[PDB]
Amino acid sequence: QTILKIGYTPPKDSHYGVGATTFCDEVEKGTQERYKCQHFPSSALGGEREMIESVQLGTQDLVNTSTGPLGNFVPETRIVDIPFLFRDYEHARKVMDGAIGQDLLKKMQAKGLIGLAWTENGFRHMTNSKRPILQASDAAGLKVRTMENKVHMDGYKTFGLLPTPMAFPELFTALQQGTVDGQENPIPVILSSKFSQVQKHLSLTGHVYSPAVLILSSRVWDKLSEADKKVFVAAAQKATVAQRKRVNDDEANGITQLKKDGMQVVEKVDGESFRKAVAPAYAGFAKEFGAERIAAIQAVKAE
Numbered sequence: 001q002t003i004l005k006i007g008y009t010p011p012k013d014s015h016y017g018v019g020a021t022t023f024c025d026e027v028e029k030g031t032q033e034r035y036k037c038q039h040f041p042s043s044a045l046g047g048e049r050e051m052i053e054s055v056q057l058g059t060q061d062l063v064n065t066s067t068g069p070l071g072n073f074v075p076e077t078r079i080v081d082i083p084f085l086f087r088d089y090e091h092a093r094k095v096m097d098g099a100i101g102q103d104l105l106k107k108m109q110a111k112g113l114i115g116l117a118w119t120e121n122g123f124r125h126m127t128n129s130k131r132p133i134l135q136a137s138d139a140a141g142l143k144v145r146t147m148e149n150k151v152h153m154d155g156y157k158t159f160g161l162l163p164t165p166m167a168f169p170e171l172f173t174a175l176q177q178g179t180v181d182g183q184e185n186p187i188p189v190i191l192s193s194k195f196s197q198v199q200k201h202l203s204l205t206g207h208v209y210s211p212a213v214l215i216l217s218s219r220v221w222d223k224l225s226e227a228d229k230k231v232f233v234a235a236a237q238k239a240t241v242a243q244r245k246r247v248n249d250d251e252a253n254g255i256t257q258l259k260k261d262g263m264q265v266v267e268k269v270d271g272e273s274f275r276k277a278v279a280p281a282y283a284g285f286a287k288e289f290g291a292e293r294i295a296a297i298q299a300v301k302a303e
Ligand SMILES: O=C(O)[C@H](O)[C@H](O)CO
Pocket: 009, 010, 048, 065, 066, 068, 121, 147, 167, 168, 184, 185, 186, 189, 210, 212
């Protein structure tokens, strides 16, 4: 078999690992051993920005990545990074799976990033080591690491937070040394990366939805038979299901485990305060993405 390197930032025992393994197993069977994965979890091939760059260049075969730094390569994808755009998992998943999400995959493909299917990272939540976050004003003044994403940076600034973009593999040490007070990630990431060791506080702010996506290099895609192309896509859609299931499991059980680990969890925040804070940034978001595209997303699964 041709060995395809698949990288991701979480450990193998994670939502992304579940997605990668499901995808890889289906590709290996579906292509009758023409292709087989070798996994590189825990940023062995670098963080997400570096990995996507390598996939676009062809020097890395596959990545399971959040949209965080993806917008650097395909700016249209940042529409899904807008804070409080999505209402819940049903809403977000339907958008990603429907025509809107499918169009974003094609926009990626035009830039040499063969997005096979949207998987999932999850709704992101704020952690810090200084104080509980009950309302937007409690976040003001905190230094918080963000992903390498201008929409997150601009959006989160409206909460009064002071953002610093950092690649994921540098995050644990940054939190440990106090370079920043906090960060934000889905429960699946907080669990699998043991941030409980260096963050005392968690608030279920659910401030953005973080999709993930299995991306193949155009170098490899263009060498595939038309039949194998179909196998890769089908395999990635099976991965979507397994990965979301693991997200679901992580959330149902994760809060209890994080509490046992010593985290102080705020389960009900003043969501209105955060939504009101970010509203002014929608001027910029609409100018960039189109108010009608924002509205099209909001309309999906709405009452
Ligand atoms: O915080 C981040 O960088 C991401 O959530 C992580 O790499 C998983 O995609």
